């Protein structure tokens, strides 16, 4: 078992996909979502380790006979957790979601295919569906327990790297698998980038197809383009954003308090005074938790006005009056 | 409850007046929609989540809520758009000797995310000592068993709780209400209604080029300007009929 070392490459302008299924024409829409950062460092592989999934992954592969036939997603890729297997064979895109004890070396043989040794087990299935020259790009993300898969196929004549061009990525699939996916791996008989929560200024042409986009967080010129809602910026000085130094750390300072508030004497007391003679106790110079009280459900009613119990633990007061 | 059953529903007509009319439901609370308008509406999918909890825990089932069940068993998103129904199950899910079939998770490393289901039975480690699959001090079983006896009070009587979550994405509608589809009329000021998206306009045949996955053509003002007729996949514009000043 041997694996090729990984290289690095420039992402260029790839990673532009319709964030929604709504038709728009000749309008410079602005969106905020998990996009592939422009000019990002995309990992490069040659024909396969277990790549972390993080928060959405952009996959790309240059193929001419469908050498890469599918993908696998999952947290541990064992029977302990669920997993997802996608295989695009011939004209069928078989997608399944079960608990698989994946084989260490998944293999698919061929031209007629007759060898399929990917997983050793398959239990508790939950979903199933059936549907160089060509560059195939896909975008996989998991948001709110929904797995979204966008795709785009282009005709290219190059093997050096990602072509320096612009294109859209139409959606293909959206499923409610609801799987905490943190790892994935392709299937052999490519390039990988990681999405980030960016803001884009997509340009819809006449026929509702994206032609150009501007990564607002890339560089000052792109940010000015986004602020002006335009691609052409005339000579001048434009105010784009605000700059604020973020806090370096956190400082918490409380006095030389040493004791614990005697709240037992007003809660666990054997007897309580009459309501017309409501007993009052002043509490000062002490430290008292408050999540402890609210964690115990023995209280029939617990209503706070002007303060919330969760925010009560981290707070200081001069004196606390307990009336029983 | 920790293993709340989930059902996906699409491609079928569903009424919603039948459930509302019946009074057998102790709790019938809708968020993001009202039952009266629910009949004349469409959705991309419906997810029904069914489970059992005691009455006191019913308050835990609602958007932006906290609690043992809420934090470790079944969490609802803040943007939940659906109806929570609940009725008493003491008549069936109560045993004189204690109904122990239903279990609820009591410990988890973090609060459960919305629509996230776990059935892990690994012994929870409450201390620094690694609980190597052995129950003991600070090594607590993740689940706990409800008593659920008829003799118990109402606050502990079992209840069957269903959560219907309607998801309306930008995809063709597949769950619609018990409303018949009228005949389409074009080039005339009409009060259209597409998949529950009401409005008034002059539906006209359009030359727009919709993509196969697209359903609504929005406008600069977020007004649905082009629509896809579900029965016949053609794109129709929506122009306001006519308006203007009346000078005298």
């Amino acid at each position, epitope marked *: 078992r041997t694996q090729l070392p990984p290289a690095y490459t420039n992402s260029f302008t790839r990673g532009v996909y319709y964030p929604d299924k709504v038709f728009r024409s000749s309008v410079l829409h602005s969106t905020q979502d998990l996009f592939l950062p422009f000019f990002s460092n995309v990992t490069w592989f040659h024909a396969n380790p277990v790549l972390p999934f993080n928060d959405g992954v952009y996959f790309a592969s240059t193929e001419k006979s469908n050498i890469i036939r599918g993908w696998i997603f999952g947290t541990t890729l064992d029977s302990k957790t669920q997993s997802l297997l996608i295989v695009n064979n011939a004209t069928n895109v078989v997608i399944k979601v079960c608990e698989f004890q994946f084989c260490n070396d998944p293999f698919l043989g061929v031209w007629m295919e007759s060898e399929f040794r990917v997983y050793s087990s398959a239990n508790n299935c939950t979903f199933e569906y059936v549907s160089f020259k060509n560059l195939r790009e896909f975008v996989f993300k998991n948001i709110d327990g929904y797995f979204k898969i966008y795709s785009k196929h282009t005709p290219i004549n190059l093997v050096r790297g990602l072509p320096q061009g612009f294109s859209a990525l139409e959606p293909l699939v959206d499923l409610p698998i609801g799987i905490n996916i943190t790892r994935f791996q392709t299937l052999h008989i490519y390039y990988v980038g990681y999405l980030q929560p960016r803001t884009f200024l997509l340009k819809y042409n006449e026929n509702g197809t994206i032609t150009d986009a501007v990564d607002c967080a890339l560089d000052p010129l792109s940010e000015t383009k986004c602020t002006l809602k335009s691609f052409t910026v005339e000579k001048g000085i434009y105010q784009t954003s605000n700059f604020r130094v973020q806090p370096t750390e956190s400082i918490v300072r409380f006095p030389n308090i*040493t*004791n*614990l*508030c*005697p*709240f*037992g*004497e007003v*809660f*666990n*007391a*054997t*007897r309580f005074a009459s309501v017309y003679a409501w007993n009052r106790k002043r509490i000062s110079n*002490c*430290v*008292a*938790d408050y999540s*402890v*009280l609210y964690n115990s459900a023995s209280f029939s009613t617990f209503k706070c006005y002007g303060v919330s119990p969760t925010k009560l633990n981290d707070l200081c007061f001069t004196n606390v009056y307990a009336d029983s | 409850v920790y293993a709340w059953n989930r059902k996906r529903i699409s491609n079928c007509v569903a009424d919603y007046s039948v459930l509302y009319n019946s009074a057998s439901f102790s709790t019938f609370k809708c968020y993001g929609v009202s039952p009266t308008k629910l009949n004349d509406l469409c959705f991309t999918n419906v997810y029904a989540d069914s489970f059992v909890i005691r009455g006191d825990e019913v308050r835990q089932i609602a958007p932006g809520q906290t609690g043992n069940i809420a934090d470790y068993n079944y969490k609802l998103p803040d943007d939940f758009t659906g109806c929570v129904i609940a009725w008493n199950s003491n008549n069936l899910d109560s045993k004189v000797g204690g109904n122990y079939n239903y279990l609820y998770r009591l410990f988890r490393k973090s609060n459960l995310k919305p629509f996230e289901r776990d059935i892990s039975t690994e012994i929870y480690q*409450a*201390g*620094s*000592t690694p609980c190597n699959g052995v129950k003991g*001090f*600070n090594c607590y079983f993740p689940l706990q068993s409800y008593g659920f006896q008829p003799t118990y009070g109402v606050g502990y009587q079992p209840y069957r709780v269903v959560v219907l979550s309607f998801e309306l994405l930008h995809a063709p509608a597949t769950v619609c209400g018990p409303k018949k589809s009228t005949n389409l009329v074009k080039n005339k000021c009409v009060n259209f209604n597409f998949n529950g998206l009401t409005g008034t306009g002059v539906l006209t045949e359009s030359n727009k080029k919709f993509l196969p996955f697209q359903q609504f053509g929005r406008d600069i003002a977020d007004t649905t300007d082009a629509v896809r007729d579900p029965q016949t996949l053609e794109i129709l514009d929506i122009t306001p009929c006519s308006f203007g000043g009346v000078s005298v």
Partner: antibody
Framework: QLVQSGAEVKKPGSSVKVSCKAS????????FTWVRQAPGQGLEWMGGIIPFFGTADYAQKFQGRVTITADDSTSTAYMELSSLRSEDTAVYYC???????????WGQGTLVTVSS | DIVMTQSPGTLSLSPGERATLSCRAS???????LAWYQQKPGQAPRLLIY???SRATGIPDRFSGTGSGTDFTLTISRLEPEDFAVYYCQQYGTSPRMYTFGQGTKVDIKR
């Protein structure tokens, strides 16, 4: 409901460290106290600590030889007694007092023996 | 400090009678509390009265406790064969330094 270390047998002049493990994050906010009792003798308080503050108070008799510490990561209060003698052979207990109840719990007890 | 004295040193009363024990403190409990515990030979101490006036869980109702200031009283309405053991009064509070015990009192069948 506290869990202490098991019964110990030590040579004279040695040291013994008795633990007292606390469940969940109910460690800092409470007050732990170590109390020993020799066989056929009365109850003899030894010391007390508050993990949230970390300062430990000791009985005048036991000053020096004994030391009480507390670790939050393991939620365990430890009491280590040095220069053990036959007089130290006794049953030890850790009692935890809460902020909101006057109901001091007790451990199951731990027998410490110092002899041949 | 605070000194706890228990009286009598050993109480000899027959079963079915009323038992009384007195615990006197060298100083009043300004911010502390008192508890009564029962221990039998070869057995761990058992807490009977917590807060000096509240019976612990499972304690028979015959046991009760009152008092204030520097003096407190533990009372048993009816004496039982299982009730003959050693009794202690312990002063305790939030502050760890408020942890001291009484010398102890023994209850035995009068003969």
């Amino acid at each position: 409901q506290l869990v202490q270390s098991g019964a110990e047998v030590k040579k004279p002049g040695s040291s013994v460290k008795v633990s007292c493990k606390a469940s969940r994050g109910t460690f800092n906010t409470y007050v732990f106290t170590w109390v020993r009792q020799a066989p056929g003798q009365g109850l003899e308080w030894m010391g007390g600590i508050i993990p949230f503050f970390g300062t430990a108070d000791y009985a005048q008799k036991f000053q020096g030889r004994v030391t009480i510490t507390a670790d939050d990561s393991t939620s365990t209060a430890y009491m280590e007694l040095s220069s053990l003698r036959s007089e130290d052979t006794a049953v030890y207990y850790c009692s935890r007092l809460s902020q909101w109840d006057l109901l001091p719990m007790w451990g199951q007890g731990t027998l410490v023996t110092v002899s041949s | 400090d605070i000194v706890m004295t228990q009286s009598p040193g050993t109480l000899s009363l027959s079963p079915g009678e009323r038992a009384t024990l007195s615990c006197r403190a060298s100083q009043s409990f300004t911010s502390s509390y008192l508890a009564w515990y029962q221990q039998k030979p070869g057995q761990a101490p058992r807490l009977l009265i917590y807060g000096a006036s509240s019976r612990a869980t499972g304690i028979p109702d015959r046991f009760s406790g009152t008092g204030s200031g520097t003096d407190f009283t533990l009372t048993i309405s009816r004496l039982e064969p299982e009730d003959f053991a050693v009794y202690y009064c312990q002063q305790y509070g939030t502050s760890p330094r408020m942890y001291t015990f009484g010398q102890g009192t023994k209850v035995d069948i009068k003969r």
